[model samples]
Target: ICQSTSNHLWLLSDILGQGATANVFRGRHKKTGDLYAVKVFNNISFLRPVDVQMREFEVLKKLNHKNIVKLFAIEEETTTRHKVLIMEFCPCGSLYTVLEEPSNAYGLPESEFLIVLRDVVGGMNHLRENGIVHRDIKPGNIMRVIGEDGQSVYKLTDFGAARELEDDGTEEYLHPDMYERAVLRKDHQKKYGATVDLWSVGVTFYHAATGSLPFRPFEGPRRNKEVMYKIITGKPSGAISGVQKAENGPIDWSGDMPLSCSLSQGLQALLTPVLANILEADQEKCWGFDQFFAETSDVLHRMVIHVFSLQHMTAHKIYIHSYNTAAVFHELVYKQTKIVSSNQELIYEGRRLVLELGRLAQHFPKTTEENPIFVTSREQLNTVGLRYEKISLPKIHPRYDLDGDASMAKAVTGVVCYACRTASTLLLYQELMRKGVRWLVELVKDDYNETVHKKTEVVITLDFCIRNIEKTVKVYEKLMKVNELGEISDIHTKLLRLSSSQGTIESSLQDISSRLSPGGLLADTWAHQEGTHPRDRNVEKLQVLLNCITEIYYQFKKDKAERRLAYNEEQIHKFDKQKLYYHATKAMSHFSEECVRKYEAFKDKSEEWMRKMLHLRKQLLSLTNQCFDIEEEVSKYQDYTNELQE
Candidate 1:
């Protein structure tokens, strides 16, 4: 960093950005570290008083718009006479920098487009009121400032191309009609006024929406009139960025894009006053870029095929915009190459532009390029089918929830949720509870802890499982007990696996702890000698509790089975021969007169055993779950005892 002459009280850091005529450097006040941009115009390049600098300073000093660039102080380099402009630096760079970025994948989002439009509109309104004009109203001249509140605020820079009402406008931003009247017809009287700035607004907004300039500078050998025609025709030929702007020919150009146009609706509303007269200036020439309308798989594909396409900045930007919004590509490049034009054409392959476009084109993720659909199809037209489809996420059903909360009760809710889900197959609740019981058994068995905290956690979890089981048992009781004639289904073998398994394969778990078995004759002598069979105090208590708990399920099952069997026999008499005979008689003209209708009797328990069998199965299943729970409890207890014995 270096300071200029002593007269200038500022520190210059580095060149912030550069243009053809001057370079803007990053600088700040020496006393305060607040950042600012310094505009430097080299006075020695064979010019005394720079026209643009003098003009910008004059305009800015008079203007007081929030959206326009602010001027602080001026410093003249005494030795070189190089003038340095002390200006407020926008931390975020200019809009052109953003537009130039390939990472922007999409040229600009609708929100950003509108924001910049609003900013420039304010700035333009300010300039007009102040008897001034920002001749260069393109993206490059628009900078984004960081506000005190940490939000974005847009401001305009570069009055080098700016002009007074008395002076002629820049050739690039001039309206076609303005060009025709002033340049060709030489009628200064019928010239561009505020509409010139408004026209720039339209062009800038188009760039924001479409990711390509609607009109570009034509620095070719053709007369300005021919260039104007090319621009006028390009405006209506399928590049206008919305259905409202969609046109096949020039006849539709006189009216503005549809009033319902999305991103540009606000701009459209503002342009309402001038748009009709703006398009009416040229009526006859309607040379259509027919390829633009030819549906490719996409505008993306159309850009790649490059048939009649410039394959330069505009076209590359289109692809980039597609990639950014559609592909979300974050990587990019900028290769600067000199651009020249022979005819009125979009010349984008300048070295710098190629470098920029090359990064955007080359680094498209490899996964995205499985097939080059358009690159291979030069002959393919009319079906380019450029569709930029944006589908929103579907609304979710109200009742469903991924994570259960306090109200739903996590495990139970999960059980129901999983059961209902089309993708789920298992009874998640039982499996989870089963696994939880097994885990707690291990904790009680291996009840070795130096610190009480971990042991406390194990005991707390173990007790919780006990409480949970009590809850589960109550819920299952209703499901288990419900068996009228119509509701019976087989649950006979629900606990078969646990009961039939070998001693090693048994639950009895919510932390069941088994004791070491008292030993044989030699072992008995060994225990007598070994201080009454060394026992873990903690394990002993846990074992006693679990053994009692496990024992209760067995006792409960025995009593319940006896009670159910007796009640079932009594209920069996409720459906008898006459009922069966009467029910069956409705179907036949004459039921078998001598037929046996002995249903809780001989007739093979005819039309019977079905309900009994179902009720019997429910009992069997209830016992099965009881047996399985204890089986695991004892299994864990035995293992722990074995470990302790060793």
Candidate 2:
């Protein structure tokens, strides 16, 4: 074999690839310095099948497409006088080389694989349209190069095995009928059609998806081509011929793909039917290139949005084209997730969709497979909360609120209300203070909302306690009607249960005091004076007055135990006067009066506390409002600059 050679027009360098009949080399134009792949035929045995070898050039010359490699020229080497075919040089190499990387050991990532599918399909369409059948349609035969747009574009190459709507490139990729005739030496005269290429495509796709051949004997097809041929023809199409350990070992006869296939479940579902149709041994059932092209192109164009469910603790994918409406998505999501459209809510980037008539493209045009859009049902939303992961907003430093604001204030009012007493500490730092004030105002709004929620809960608890006390009074009336003295004694035990409830109410008050008073969430947040930064003492000023108001509310408590002790002693007399009626009347009066009086006091205190907390919350809100007003004025002043600048 000639290791190196050059013509007057071009210089041949390292060998790019080697085949049975020719060796491909990196050739450079001598004058222009343009690169090309110079495929040189072996000179020693060139006489036997020279015409067959030259067919590649014949096929490539007439074809023209963005997805098909271009042929440059046909020439002879000056030294050896050997024929060379110059074609487009793809520096990035082939799809086989891409799949060889360890990171792609399972399969190409979803996005990359879509690109491969699109480009290959496009190339095949062009080839078929030109009445050419590229029999060798594997990853190895598909070349990748950077396009003018700087994106990878795969082109079909090596047309030596190509023929006019006819086609042997590889044994494993051959159709079962073709394999029977070519390798098994059976039915030699059985003519093959262009669909023979589709079989190869199916195998190549399987390899691209799983990073392994669909059918592989332990020793491979070279050693056991007979067994491989038998396995291919014996089973129905879509059955995977796995890599067996033993010669007669258990073969994997399943049509299901392995778990290692990294294709999305939605994509896998789409590809499965296509693979089944194309890989069919019976040409009658096999799909034509049009069907294959249509299906693959459909998959390429559509977007797959992953929808996760908190209730099911699982995920489903909904495929949508640009035309798919919000209602369509709702139905599709419901079909896959088993949540009815009425109850289901879809949210992406803070926009929510719930069976609306508008198109999904308008709502989530930029959604991809990587970032899943969340789906939740109304039932689950109420019971277990949202499916979205909890995210704490980034905590703004206290200095951003205190020192920064004072600096802005100083810039505006001169040294924190000192009016430029020292000339050295003057001029602009207003924006810094503005940013502080804005963020601080936002922080207070958050606290204000939190306080409102806490206040509502307090009111609810107070109402609940009063209801329980009112119910206990009714139970007292029911006890008085009982004829037996033993029943009255049992009723006394029930009345004692109120004491535990009293303890609970007292604890509730303590819990409220802990939250509103110093050392609480409000205190810890407001008390920035302890930090290294200079304190504005802004919140401290408000807290001093609010804490006094809080103490006033905190002072109210339940009446002492002696009142309940008196009721217990008097009730011990049971029925004295003429038995039942008179005794029952006095007992009911005593129980009702005491219960009613105690609850009245609870109501008054609860109302007072609610009013005080609301006042404190209102003050905080007012400060935020003032900050916003100043911010608006600053913004308005900023607008004045635009007009002044002109």
Q: What does candidate 2's lDDT look like per residue over 1-646, in tens digits?
A: 3333354243344678777677788877766788878877765433436575567557667787888888887777766777777788999999998876434556677677778888888988887787556766889889999888887889998764432222442655866887555454424224345677787888888888876687877668677886788777777766644556687785667676666564656677777778777887676678777778988988888877676553343445667775678777777778766688787755544444344577555456455433356565544221121122111112222332223322222222211111111111111111112222233334434565554454444434444444554575568659775443454344444434433443454455445445555564434332132211113232232233223322221221111122332454334322211222232233334323432243334333323333444454455555445434433433332122212343
lDDT per residue as tens, model 1, 301-409: 3122111111111111213333333222212111111122211121111111112322443443222111111111112112111112221112222331212111122
Best by lDDT: 2
Question: Once model 2 is optimally superposed onto the true structure by TM-score, how far is the C-alpha of residue 394 displaced, in angstroms?
Answer: 44
Q: Which residue segments of model 2 deviate by more than 4 Å?
A: 1-13, 44-59, 160-191, 237-247, 311-317, 358-363, 369-371, 378-646
Q: What is the lDDT of residue 644 in candidate 1?
A: 33
lDDT of 2 at 381: 21
Model 2's lDDT to the true fold? Answer: 0.55
What TM-score would candidate 2 get against the native?
Answer: 0.53
Q: For model 2, give the 10-residue run with minimal summed lDDT.
A: 419-428
